[PDB]
Design a protein around this ligand. Structure first.
Ligand code: NDP
Ligand code: NDP
Ligand code: NDP
Ligand code: NDP
Lengths: 346, 337, 337, 347
């Protein structure tokens, strides 16, 4: 029903397209991709993926700029400058900006100037005028006419927010810190090489790498009540995908026990967050969460309250798939409510 | 006695600088470093290496355009276009081109324009350029050459012991496959690349990629032209790689005879370049190894009397650097103008 | 129909069970599982696999000595000494020996004593034992054999396309090297082992170890006796491996002719076992591949008209299991009394 | 001066021997090793180490049971049953029990029965009658005649305790939780296989693996005041060595700021804990702490107080080397305070 473009055919963008394909009947309809590599480089990587595994469906190269996923064509263009994009010509209704470059008003908006109707950033906005949504939490807050540029937050923030809510909304969060053992990512160096952050510049594959993260603060953007109460770091560990968060907020309420904190999740899990939150009691490990549709999963057996007031939780989330799945829900929304420096490490 | 400039302070750039610091009375003298990175970047990474480990020396960020190493001061500049680098202003006699882009006449030349006198390309040369592999034909060099390539990390390994073979059993023909550690060139995660293989995971796969070292041998051992050729496999390891040569010689031979020959040369002519090792080791056991190639004796095996297979380890980073230095070490000697 | 017992519910034990569940109308029927691990252990790991991923089926811990898979119930016992297992009591017709210890006449036999009728060793047999490689000589089998080995994961790859070569170009002699993913056999951290190589890091090195698949080929392709031989390299990957064969044939040949031959057989006789792939892929791209061997066409290259090199991928775990099943699948057919 | 035996020539035990060799002039003197593999298997692994790198010194195989590190011989025996050990015959004064099996009174003591004078466990004791020491914290509490069996605690506990002290002893620790992103270890499976703990049974190299840890509680064993106030989990990540702790205790004191919390360390670092604690302000990564002699290093830039009361710290510690180095200090102690003065699972 609604024409969609995907600017940036990498992990998240490709994870997107995949998510969308095998779906109920999304109102969305990917008709164009912007991968600076042609139909070849854009096809191959959609068919063979080291983290998701060979894509299950006939993907052929029609035209010199038009591959097809089971017959359905997809025009593919390439240009670093959105302004030159045929958004208007094609009549693009939604644009999934997944490059990590155009994340400010001026930037991401270049898509509107090209002829785009609405733009969704697959990352946190650098501006302040752009709304940050997190399906499960405050998705309602989005309605047509209200800003034509939105951000589906962060992979981490989209894993935290959900269960952070249930915590405060049913126990009262005084304040707390948090850490996140995170699977390395593209922004990291493969081998020790120049990079604006001397941590990310270290072999992504052979180091536990500490790196700042706003994902903590940004929780507020969707949960105002917490504004300036959360915070934390992040640790990159040699694991291509699937990460875990370690939240430690000393509650306001009484001094409840462990297994009841859980029950709240369990309750809010099969209830209002049916599709976002979930609790897995069976002791597994990262690799068991690959391709997990839940924006967040709590390791039951890991939760533990310390001094009556201090609660500690651990959640599992697939940073590639999960997020991409929400990004398709957030784009699914838009449609259901429709009438130094510049470069810096590439 | 010879002023040097390191352009492309990457893995080979640094592995070199350090390789140098360890040499005694080095005709070489580093004075300027050019890399897209700021003085911070140059310092940190010269000091803290994830493969060579922290550098044993005092490395501080002395200056806005320089860094200090045990007192010896060096300038750090940063122009993505060579022509600008003040090579002429600083009287740069030699430039160690380790950027991976300027590998052709046109490119490497921009250094000459900047006022540099010579350009040693830390990689195989593209087109018509003098290729020398220390130990295989460094005598071919003449101060006349303004642009030379010290071949690839692989060739620099495979060559030495190929010479030994042919020069003794006569290589008729033969393929080879190098199980190689990954490099900056690979993508950390399935991302675009001009080599859809190299474009893959890198740390999660055995990535078959092609290598020139196959034909490049002939470059330095004219005799083997079109007799060798192989591929390469990029496996999940940050350093040290192994080559699996398989040549068919004329003179019927046997297992230990081959190895023997190797040792002989390793003890005489190639002393310092080639070497053998009987102690059953593994990758990691070959870090920081000053030699270019190391034969895993216990692995060498012959078939039908004429088909010889030889496995050989080599530190694609350090050992190569040590060669790069040894080459530049040479340019300083036999230097007239 | 044919009652089966899985002894050694390890990687091949499970990779097998699952390989089985996927087959339609399987003459095989698993009823008992014996592994040092409790019902918990058997359940969990059959359901959650770090390489095959979570198993698509309902797997619960039904019983104190059993587990359930989609309803089909299976008993789980645990005796470190076979003789005790109630093979006779349960009328065990076939036992899938995947423990890695009982690989000899004496050992595998303890299963016969327990009352079992036949013993399929999921590995090469040690000593005088029938070795069969589905696609290379399964017709050699006869219900008379009480103990057979389905060869190694490597041999099961290398064999199929070796037959194709010899049977068409005549293999004179040739070596091979298999870049192999690591296995339970290696040490996670430098620890004692009878193979000081295998004893090393495993995940941080390229570990040269030896393989029998070299001479084992001859076991099933009598003709190549003493013509083949190679080593192996254990690189940091949990699964899927590649073989680098290098044979010298009599009949002069060229690149694409070889590949062609392969395809032809892959489309006719070896259909289901061998296969070719032109799309430039990498390790990970070969998980869960029902075939034993897959030729990387674009890599195949010839030298001097008679020296052929062929690269070939294979899932050392899944692909093998699928063979194990196919072998047991056979024992069920051509089974009299 | 004092004769030392090493029961268990693996990582920690070998890391020991190494630590000891290149040393000032330790009163210790390794004269025997118990590696169930002979001089070969025991030599090779001392010379070539994947995590420490080729050992710098002539290591040759003399006798059929007596290798030598630069001339100095080391007799090597092998037997799973300590009772059969020649401790008495050789006259062993200290035994570094680094196997992870003999960690209870009855067990570790089998060494005394064999003829050993004193036994040091390179891990937490399973009993209750065995003293747990942590150089830097409560080493003084050890004096001859007081138990002939001690435990140098855990790699984690020996990293926590130190800076956990300075926190409570100069800020007052109400209570708090903690996590530890830990380098995988020998007790983990290489590939998914049977193991008493269905988490450790998963590919140590390709998973973030959650596994309980007492290292948290045991802090009390050396710092009673905290008894039953700390606690936490642990996460195994694909990194052969060097780990980090993530402590989150909401303080009792005022509501101090970040960089001052640090200063406490910095102060107690170059002071009472000179050799144990330390603070590195320069942003590095795990691999930069390989071979770190400090039992604990705090990442300055990572520390951060939240609500005035809640403090959060992150420390770096080489689990192999560091611990092994303390283990040589704790065995160094024993000698400086020695007369001449006053269902069995896993694999
Ligand atoms: N991976 C994950 O789990 C998560 C990532 N994100 C965020 O989403 C963004 C994308 O992440 P990820 O998918 O990992 O990244 P990828 O590298 O997979 O994708 C980015 C894509 O953008 C292309 N590109 C780069 N510059 C331009 C340009 N100027 N114009 C057009 N296209 C361009 C890149 O091509 P090329 O490389 O050739 O320049 C690449 O194809 C980042 O902000 C990331 O932080 C958010 C949540 C989770
Ligand atoms: N890696 C190895 O094992 C071997 C590599 N070599 C050769 O040595 C060369 C370098 O390889 P390697 O060290 O691995 O690569 P790296 O990428 O590690 O090093 C090259 C460095 O140069 C920087 N750079 C690129 N362009 C410029 C520029 N215009 N001005 C200033 N700095 C720039 C790069 O930054 P950025 O990427 O951000 O542009 C990078 O930091 C190549 O020729 C390679 O083939 C030879 C033997 C072995
Ligand atoms: N891994 C691979 O890629 C391939 C392996 N194979 C062969 O298959 C066999 C199994 O290999 P693999 O699956 O990798 O190994 P694993 O170690 O994964 O599996 C063997 C299993 O048997 C269990 N076991 C050991 N002894 C007994 C016993 N006495 N009674 C009952 N159970 C026991 C082991 O438990 P525990 O360790 O606790 O004793 C383990 O669970 C070997 O012959 C191997 O050569 C064939 C092709 C490929
Ligand atoms: N690695 C680290 O960073 C830390 C480890 N520790 C603890 O220290 C202990 C050792 O750890 P680690 O060094 O990693 O382990 P290793 O596997 O390196 O060492 C254990 C050694 O004991 C030998 N062994 C096993 N059983 C016996 C026996 N019954 N009799 C005699 N010798 C035996 C083993 O030989 P074999 O394998 O052939 O049976 C091996 O040589 C464990 O408790 C561990 O939790 C504590 C702090 C840190």
């Amino acid at each position: 029903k609604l024409k969609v473009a995907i600017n940036g055919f990498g992990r998240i963008g490709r994870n997107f397209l995949r998510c969308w394909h095998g779906r109920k009947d999304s109102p969305l309809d990917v008709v164009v991709v912007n991968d600076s590599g042609g139909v070849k480089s854009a096809t191959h990587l959609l068919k063979y993926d080291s983290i998701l595994g060979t894509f299950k469906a006939d993907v052929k190269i029609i035209d010199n700029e038009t591959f097809s996923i089971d017959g359905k064509p997809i025009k593919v263009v390439s240009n670093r400058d959105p302004l030159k994009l045929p958004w208007a010509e094609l009549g693009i209704d939604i644009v999934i900006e997944g490059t990590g470059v155009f994340v400010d008003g001026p930037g991401a908006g270049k898509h509107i100037q090209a002829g785009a109707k609405k733009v969704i950033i697959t990352a946190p906005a650098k501006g302040s005028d752009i709304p940050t949504y997190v399906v499960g939490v405050n998705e309602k807050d989005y309605g047509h006419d209200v800003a034509n540029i939105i951000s589906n937050a962060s992979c981490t923030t989209n894993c935290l927010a959900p269960f952070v809510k249930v915590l405060d909304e049913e126990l009262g969060i005084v304040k707390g810190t948090m850490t996140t053992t995170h699977s390395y990512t593209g922004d990291q160096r493969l081998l020790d090489a120049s990079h604006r952050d001397l941590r990310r510049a270290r072999a992504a594959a052979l180091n536990i790498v500490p790196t700042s993260t706003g994902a903590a603060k940004a929780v507020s953007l969707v949960l105002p009540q917490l504004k300036g109460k959360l915070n934390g770091i992040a640790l990159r560990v040699p694991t291509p995908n699937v990460s875990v968060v370690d939240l430690v907020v000393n509650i306001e309420k009484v001094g409840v026990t462990a297994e009841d904190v859980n029950n709240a999740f369990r309750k809010a899990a099969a209830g209002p967050l049916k599709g976002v939150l979930d609790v897995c009691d069976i002791p597994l490990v990262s690799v068991d969460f690959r391709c997990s549709d839940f924006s967040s999963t709590i390791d039951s057996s890991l939760t533990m309250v310390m001094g009556g007031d201090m609660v500690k939780v651990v959640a599992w989330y697939d940073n590639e798939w999960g997020y991409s799945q929400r990004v398709v829900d957030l784009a699914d929304l838009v449609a259901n409510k429709w009438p130094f420096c510049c470069k810096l490490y590439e | 006695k010879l002023k040097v400039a390191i352009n492309g302070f990457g893995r080979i750039g640094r592995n070199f600088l350090r390789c140098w610091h360890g040499r005694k009375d080095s005709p070489l003298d580093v004075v300027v470093i050019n890399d897209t990175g700021g003085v911070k970047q140059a310092s940190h990474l010269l000091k803290y290496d994830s493969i060579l480990g922290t550098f044993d020396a005092d490395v501080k960020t002395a200056g806005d355009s320089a860094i200090s190493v045990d007192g010896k001061v060096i300038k750090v500049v940063s122009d993505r276009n060579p022509v600008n680098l003040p090579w002429g202003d600083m009287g740069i006699d030699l430039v160690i081109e380790g950027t991976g882009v300027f590998v052709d006449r046109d490119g490497a030349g921009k250094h000459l324009q900047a006022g540099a006198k010579k350009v040693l390309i830390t990689a195989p040369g593209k087109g018509d350029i003098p290729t020398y592999v220390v130990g295989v034909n460094e005598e071919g060099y003449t101060h006349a050459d303004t642009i030379i390539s010290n071949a690839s990390c692989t060739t620099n390994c495979l060559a030495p012991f190929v010479k030994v073979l042919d020069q003794k059993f006569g290589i008729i023909k033969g393929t080879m496959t190098t199980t190689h550690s990954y490099t900056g060139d690979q993508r950390l995660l399935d991302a675009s690349h001009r080599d859809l293989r190299r474009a893959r995971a890198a740390c999660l796969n055995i990535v078959p990629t092609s290598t020139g070292a196959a034909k490049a041998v002939a470059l330095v051992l004219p005799n083997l032209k079109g007799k060798l050729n192989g591929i390469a496999l990029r496996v999940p390891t940050p350093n040290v790689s192994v080559v699996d040569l398989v040549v068919q010689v004329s003179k019927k031979t046997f297992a230990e005879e081959v190895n023997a020959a190797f040792r002989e040369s390793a003890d005489n002519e190639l002393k310092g370049i080639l070497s053998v090792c009987d102690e059953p080791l593994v990758s990691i056991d070959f870090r920081c190894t000053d030699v270019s190639s190391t034969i895993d004796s216990s692995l060498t095996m012959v078939m039908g009397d004429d088909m010889v297979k030889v496995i050989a380890w080599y530190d694609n980073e350090w050992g190569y650097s040590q060669r790069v230095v040894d080459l530049a070490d040479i340019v300083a000697n036999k230097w007239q103008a």
